[PDB]
Amino acid sequence: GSLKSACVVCLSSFKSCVFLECGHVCSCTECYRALPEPKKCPICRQAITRVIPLYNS
Ligand SMILES: [Zn+2]
Ligand SMILES: [Zn+2]
């Protein structure tokens, strides 16, 4: 289910982040950090104001 579960940026780590405010779950944590500034969601291209773990903190 890699379309559903693999990070859409590297395709090498599982998705692990929720992007706010757009709400999309598309990226692992390393790819988020690596995103060029200003950081935008790979899915919808909205600015990412905050990252929270998909695994509930
Ligand atoms: Zn990744
Ligand atoms: Zn988005």
Curated annotation (Swiss-Prot):
Name of the featured protein: Mitochondrial ubiquitin ligase activator of NFKB 1
Effect on the protein upon substituting residue 10 to S: Failure to reduce TP53 levels and abolishes ligase activity
Zinc fingers (RING-type) by residue: 7-45
Job description of the protein: Exhibits weak E3 ubiquitin-protein ligase activity. E3 ubiquitin ligases accept ubiquitin from an E2 ubiquitin-conjugating enzyme in the form of a thioester and then directly transfer the ubiquitin to targeted substrates. Can ubiquitinate AKT1 preferentially at 'Lys-284' involving 'Lys-48'-linked polyubiquitination and seems to be involved in regulation of Akt signaling by targeting phosphorylated Akt to proteasomal degradation.
Annotated organism of origin: Homo sapiens
Location of cross-link Glycyl lysine isopeptide (Lys-Gly) (interchain with G-Cter in ubiquitin): 4
Tissues expressing the protein: Widely expressed with highest levels in the heart, skeletal muscle, placenta, kidney and liver. Barely detectable in colon and thymus.
Entry note about domains: The zinc finger domain is required for E3 ligase activity.
PTM annotation, UniProt: Ubiquitinated by PRKN during mitophagy, leading to its degradation and enhancement of mitophagy. Deubiquitinated by USP30.
Stretches in topological domain Cytoplasmic: 2-57
Subcellular location: Mitochondrion outer membrane; Peroxisome
Known partners and oligomeric status: Homooligomer. Interacts with MAP3K7/TAK1. Interacts with UBC9. Interacts with and sumoylates DNM1L. Interacts with MAVS. Interacts with TP53 (via N-terminus); the interaction leads to ubiquitination and proteasomal degradation of TP53.
